[model samples]
Target chain A: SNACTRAVYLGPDRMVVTGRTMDWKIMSNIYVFPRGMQRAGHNKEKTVNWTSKYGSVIATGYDIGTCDGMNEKGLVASLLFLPESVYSLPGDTRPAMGISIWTQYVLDNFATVREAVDEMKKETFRIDAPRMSTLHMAITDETGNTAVIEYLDGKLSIHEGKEYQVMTNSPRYELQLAVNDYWKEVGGLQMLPGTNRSSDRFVRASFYIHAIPQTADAKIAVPSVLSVMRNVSVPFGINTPHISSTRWRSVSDQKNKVYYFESTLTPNLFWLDLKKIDFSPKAGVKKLSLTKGEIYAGDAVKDLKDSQS
Target chain B: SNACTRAVYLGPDRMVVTGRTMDWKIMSNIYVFPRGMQRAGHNKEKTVNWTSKYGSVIATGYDIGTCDGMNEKGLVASLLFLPESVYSLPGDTRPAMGISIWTQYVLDNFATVREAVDEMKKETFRIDAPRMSTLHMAITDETGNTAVIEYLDGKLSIHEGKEYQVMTNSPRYELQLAVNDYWKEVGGLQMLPGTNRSSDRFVRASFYIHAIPQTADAKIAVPSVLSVMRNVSVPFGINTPHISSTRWRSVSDQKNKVYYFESTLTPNLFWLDLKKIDFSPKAGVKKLSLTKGEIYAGDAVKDLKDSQS
Candidate 1:
C-alpha cells in the first residue's frame, strides 16, 4: 500500500503543494525533458516522441518513475496510488511501458489544463499498462481551475469543475466526494477534519487552500503554500505501531516553472529551475544535486544551483 | 473567537469523566454551589439550593461559565458550541438560569452517560437563557460508553449507543458521521486527515483513540493517549493570521480516578487524583495548580505537590 498523494493550493499569487510519498526511499530525481527531444529505451521499443508541444520539468521515482510533474503552461499533474483502482494500457502494447512513465507522458505532450483534459479525453496515448496499484489524478491550471480523473469499474471517470477538486489516495474519487459532502454540511468554518487519511486530507487541504491568503508574489506565495503543506504533512516517523510516516513531499509553482521537493528526514528544501535548464536531447540530460543525493528540507533552495559553473 | 472543546478516550480499566477546555476568559466562573447550595445574585432571585448529591470538578470559560465537568460517579459532561446550529430553550421558562449552569446541572445530578441521557430526554431540567451558539454535547460513564446530544431547531436531539460519539464544534452529528464515512472508505491505511480544524481533529482523535494499544496498565495507556492528543492539538501560538491554537487538553482515567491536563504553553502535565479527594459538599472545594502551568513533560506528581506546597 505504498503510494504518494498531494494537494496544491493556488492562491492569487502563490501555489502551495503538499504531498506524501508512500513507499521507501523512492530515489526521486528531477529532469527537464523538453519538446522535440526523442529517446528510446532497452526494449527495442522507440518513442520518436513528437516535439513536446509543451516544455516541462518532472520529478522521477527511482529515476524511472514520473509520478508528478508540471509543464511551462500552468498545467499540473499529480499521480496517487489506488490499489483497488486501476487503468490498464490498451492496444498493441508498443514497447515495454511501466507505471513509471505516466507523468512523463503528460509532460511530453500537454501544455494547458484544458489541453491536457481535452487530449486526455481523446485516449490516443498508450496508457493502459499494468500498474502496481490503481492510480487516480487531479490536474489544475493557473486559474484555480481543477479536474479529477479516476479509473473505477473498468471505466475512466473524469470530473471537471472549478470546485470539484482535491485528490488523495484510495476509495475512488466518487466516494471521496460523498464523504467530503458530509463534512461540507458540517462546514469548514467551525471545525475541519484533520488526519493523514485521504478524505480528511482532501477536505482540509481544499478548505485551507481557499482560506489561505493568496499573494501575488511568487516568493511570498510559495513559502505560504509550503507552510500549508507542512501543516498537512505528517511529522517524520509518526508511526504508532500501526501507521507509517510520510516519506517525502513535492510542490510545483506552475506559473513560475519551479519545482520544489522536501523529504521527511532532511532539513533543507531544494528545488529545480526549469527555465534555466537545457532540455535538448543532445544536451545529455544533466542532473543537479542540492543536498548531494540526500533528502532536503522544504526551504533549502539556497543550496540549489542552475549550473556547475 | 473564544472556544474550547475536548474528549477523553477513557479505557474501561481507567474510566472517569475527562474533558479539555478553552478558556475564552469570558470572566465567568463555574459555580460549584452544593446540591443544596443557594446563590444570591441578579434578579433578586431566590431558588431551592441543591443538597450536593454529588461533588464535581469542572472546566470553566468565563469564570461564570461551566463548559464541562464530571462528578464522583464517573459521569462526564462536555459542551461544544455549534454556532450555525442549536436548540433554543423554549418559552416555558421554569427557572431563569444562565446557560453557564448547563454542565453544573449535569454534574450535580447524573452519575453516568446513560443517566444523563435518560433524564435530559424528559426535559426535566429547564435552563433559562437565550441560545448563544449552535452547541452539542458528549458524555461517558465508567464503562467507557459514549453518547452525543445536540440541540437543533430548538429541540434536544440525543444519539446514544456505543458509537454515539460526539465531537467539538460545527455541522452536527449526522454530518460529522457522513464526513467520517468518507474518510472511512478511504481507509486509515493510506491517509488520514491531520489538522486542528474540528472535523480534522475529530477524525484523527477518533481513529487514534481506537487504533492505540489498549493495555491494562493504567500508566502506559494514559501516556499513550496523551501523546495522541498532543499530536492532534494545534501547536501553541501557531497563528497563521487565521488559525487558532489549543488551550488545554484533558485525559481522564475513570478507573484510576486520575484526570490529566496538558497546556500548550506549559512544560508540565498535572492530574487531579479523585481517589485522594473527598467528594462531598461538606469537604469543601479546593483549587490546585501546576508549577509552570505551561506544558507537562513527564511524571512529576511528587514534585508537583512539593512545588504547590
Candidate 2:
C-alpha cells in the first residue's frame, strides 16, 4: 500500500484533516492531529523563524514530523515525490531544514500557494538531507482551488492552473501534465489512466474532484472525497520486485478546525480538535507521542498526550 | 503495436480457442470448421465430410468454419479477440464465431488436460477487431500443461503455470501480471473489472496474474510455454463490445515448431513450414502464430470479401 494524507474543505468554516500511516499489510493508522497548534522552522541558523500564522493539526511519521495536516483556514497540504527531483548544492551557509521538516514547514507556515511561494523564495535555507529527491506537494483552499508544487533544477516549480488541482508522485509534475494531455486527447469520457501509480492517482483525483457533485454538507462530502482517495490508494501488501508500493493515506477538513489521520495497518480513524488544545507561545512546544498504543481501534479517542517528544 | 491470438485445451484436444484479427479500422468475417474438412456444416454438405477419428477445428461466428485448426490427434483449438472487430449479430446461421471465440472454444474441445497442454501457450494474438472486453485464451496439450490466453483485458492476461500458460492484449503481458497482483489482496481487484474502465483494467489484470512467478526465468519460461497455440487464426477488423483492440503478437520455438502465421489488418505473419510442423497425430500437436506482421503484411493470399455479410 502507499502512504497518503489529505484535507477536506467542508464549507469555509468547518474542516477535517487525516493522515494515513499505511504499510503493506493493512490500511491502518492513528488519525492524529487536528486544528489549533503552532509549528515553526527557522532557517539553518535556527534564527530566521516564523511562528505558524494559521493554527493546524497534523499526522506523524513515527510521531516525529508532520506528513499530513490542515490549517484553521480550511487550507490543506500533502507531500508525495517526484523521483526526478534535484536540489540546490550544499556548502551554502543559508538557513536550512532537514528533509523531515519539509511537510511540517508547509503546515506550520503559509495559508496559500501564494503565501508559501513567497516564503519559499525568501528562505535561502538549504535542505540538508539524504534521499531528498522525488518530492512534490499538493495544496487546496476553501475556494475549491488547488495547486501542485515540485522542485526541479534547484528551483521550486509550481503548477497553479485551475485545472491542476491534484498531485501524485514521480515523473515530475510537468511530465504528468504531458501524459495527462495525451490522455485528455484520448478523452477521460473515453479512456483514463488506471494504474495505481501516483501519477495515475493525480490524474484520477483531478478529474474526479471536478466531476463529483460538490456537496454542501461536511459528513456527506467528507466520505465522498475519501472514497475517491481510497480509489486512488494502492492496495495493501502489494509488492513488486522493482516498484515501491503505497503505505497509507490521510484527509483534512480545515473549516471545522479538526485534522484527521488514518493508517492502512489499523482499524480506526482518529483526529485532534483545535478547539480543545493550547498553542500559546508561552505554552511552549509540548510533546505528544502518538506512540503505537495511543491510537485506538476503529475510531476511538484517548486523552491528548504531550505534543512533542 | 503488439498483436496475437490463443486457444485453450479442455479435454482430449476438445478446445475453445480465440482468433484476434488485429490492427485495422474494421473487420468482416471469421469462420470455423470441423475435422476432415467436412463441407463446413452449412452452405453445402457436398464439400467434404469424413467421419473418421479426429474431432477438432470448429470455427465460430461465420460459415467460414476453419478458425482454430486442429487434426485428428484429439487436439483442440482457438484464436484471439481483436479490437478491430466491427461485426454485429446477423439473422444468419452462417455458423460464425464471436470475437470472444479467441479463448472461449479452446476449453470446449480437448479431452485430457495433458493431451492439449504440450503447446507453447504464451503467444498473444492481435487481429483487428473492436469490442469492449478485448480478450485472450488458454490451452492444455494432451500432456496436461495448461496455458492462458488473453487479449487487452486492457493489460495482457497470460494463462500461466505448468498448469496454464498463454496470454494476449493491450498492456504487455508482463505488465498485466504486475497490475493484476497489485489489486488481488484488496479483494476488489475483480470488481467492476475495468470496463474499458481505467480502474477496471488496473485491478483485474493486476489480480489475475500476481504471484505468477514463484522464481526467476519465470518470465522467460512463462512466455516460452505460451507460444504453442499460434496456429488458429482470427481475421482482421472485427468488433464487439467485449472484444477489441490489438496490434499483434505470437510465439514459436519454445514449444519447438517453426510454424508462424500473421493475421493483421494487412494480414502479415501467417506462415507454416509443414516439415517443421509437428504432425504427431500421436507425437502431439503444437500451436504457432507469427510475431505479428512479420509475415501477413504482404503475403496474405486471399481476403474472404463476402465472408461476414
Candidate 3:
C-alpha cells in the first residue's frame, strides 16, 4: 500500500506546523507514549538498546513499531513507505537497528532536525528488521527545521534544510526534488500534479504549503495547513485491488504544541495538546483509541487513557 | 488569473459524465436557459441569431455569456480560457459569431459530437468578441462522444471522438495532447503532474476518470466522477495577489440527465435534473441564482425560476 506525506509550515510568530497523512489499509491505534521506556530492535541477536529520552505520541504499524509520531520537544517524525529504501547488506560490521523503530529513534533522542541529521551521518546502525521494510523518514523540529532521510544503495542520504519542507515516498528524495524543481518553474497556481501517488503528493504539498497565507494566528494557519494535507490525502475506499487508500492524517502544530489527528471514518477533527501532556519520567504511557468509531471534536487532550502495557 | 478543466467519463451502461471547473475572480451566477429562448452573438453588425434548439444549464462569465453548460439532449459544452486562441483576419468573409457563444452555438444545434465536428468543419463563422476573448470549447454527448474545438493562428482546429476526453486551458489542444502523451508514458499513478495549471488538470482527470471503477450505478459512478473533479479543483482563496482560484465546478451525467453544480463557498452540492426540465419550443428561459450564497441540495430541477427578462 502507498503511504504517508509530511510537510512543515513555517509561519509568522514562529508558528511551525508539521503535518502528515498515515495511509495504510490496516487500522493502527495511535498512542501517546511517555519517556523513560526501554526499547530494542526487532533483531534478537543484533538488537540495539535505548531508554527513550523524549516522551512522544506515535501511530504504530501492525502494532509492532512506530510509523509516525511527535516528540515532547516539538520534533515530529514520520515513517513513510519508500520502495527505493535500501539497507546495508549482510556481514556489515555496523551495529543493527530494526527499520521499524527508525522514526521512533529520531523522535526519542533528537530535539532538532540538525541533531538528527548530524548523528545520522555517522551511520551508527544497519537496518535489520524481520523483513527488510522499504521506508524513509521525515523529521521537523520546533524551530521549523526539516530533514528527509533516505537509504539509497545501502548508504544513508540526508536532505536537511528549511527548503526540504515536504517529503513523500519513492523515486528517492533527490529525484523528488528534481521533479519539484520542474513544477516550481511551472509554478503552483499555473499547474500542479494531482494524484495520490507519492511524488505527485510531494509536488502538491510542496507548492500548497508555501502558497497558503503566512498567518501568525493559529486559528488561521492550522486549518490552512490541514487543508493542504487533506488535498493530498488519498480518498477513502480507493483500493483498486492493488493498493489501499489513506486512512488517517496527523498535523502537528509544533510551536503551539498541538497534535491533530483526522480519520477518514470520522466527521470531527481531533487534537492532543502536548503542552497539557505530562512528559515527566514518572508519567505513564497513554493510548488514544481512534478505531472504536468514537467521535471527537476540537482539542482531545483529555481523552487519552493510561496504557496497560 | 485562473485556469479551467474538462473531462468526460466513459463507464458501464452508457454512463457518460462530463465535468468542468470554472476558475475566475469575480462572482458569476450560473443559470439554466430553456428552449425557445432567443439569442445572438455579441458582434453588433455581424451578429449570428438563433432560437435555442435545446434547453441548457450554464455557468456565466462576466454574467453575460455561457462559459459552461449542458443541453437537453445530454450534450455538454464547456468554454475554457486559452491564451493561445486566435481568430480570422477582418476581411476573411466568414460569417461572424462572438466567442462568448461558441459553446452555446454547439449546444443549441448539435446532438452528437460527430454532428458538431462535421458542421464546424465547414467554417461557416469566424469568431468575433468585444476584445477577442481567448478560449477553446469542449463538447461531449450522451453517447460518450467528445470533441475539443480550438482556434490556432486564426484557423479552426477540432479534435473529435471519445479519445479526446480531456481539455484544459493554454497551449493548443494538439500540444496539450502531446504533453498528455508524455505523461501517459510516465503513467498517472507513477507520477501525475500536480498543479492547478490547465494541462496538469487535463492529465490528472484523464487518468483518474478511467482509473475509477466503471460502475453503472449512479450512486457509485457520480460521486467517483465528482471526486476527480474536486481533485483538480483549485483551493478557494488561493490567489498569489496575481492568480485566482477555482470558483465552481459542474458535472453532467449525460445518460442520467443529471447536471451537478458545486460552488467553493457553498456547503451543499446542487443539481438540475435535465430530464425533468421542459425543453419544448414554448418553454420559457429560466435562471438559478448561485451568486447570492444560496444553499441547494439534491435535484434542483424545480428550483429554477423563470427569468424576469
Comparing chain B with the reference, what is the TM-score for each candidate? 0.81, 0.32, 0.94
For candidate 2, give the docking quality class from DockQ.
incorrect
Write the residue-wise lDDT of candidate 1 on A68-165 in tens digits: 77776657777777766646434444443345666666667766567768977865443444322457777777665778887765466788866765
Worst 10 residues of 2 chain A by lDDT: A19-28
Score every model by TM-score.
0.51, 0.49, 0.67
Q: Is candidate 1 or candidate 3 better by DockQ?
A: 3
The deviation in Å at residue B271 for candidate 2 is 19
Candidates by DockQ, descending order? 3, 1, 2
- Model 1 chain A: weakest 10-residue lDDT segment is A39-48
Report the C-alpha displacement of residue A128, candidate 1, in angstroms.
Answer: 4.2
lDDT of 2 by residue, B1-309 (tens): 323434222222222222222222222222222222222212321221222234332233232223344333333344433333223333323233334443323434344445334321332222223332343444544343545544343233345454333334435445555655554443542232434322343343333333223222423423432332222222334455333444343322212212233333444454332233322333332322222222334222232122221
Best-performing candidate as measured by lDDT: 3
Full-model lDDT for every candidate: 0.58, 0.44, 0.77
Give the per-residue lDDT digits (tens) of candidate 3, residues A1-309. 676788888888789998888777555777877898878765565666888899998888674478888898889888888886788765677777877787788888889888888888888788865562688888889888888888887888888888789998878988888999998898776666676877778888888888877888776667667667767877544644555566677888898778887665553467888888888888888887766766665667777788876
Best-performing candidate as measured by TM-score: 3
lDDT of 2 at A133: 29
Q: Rank candidates, lDDT, best first.
A: 3, 1, 2
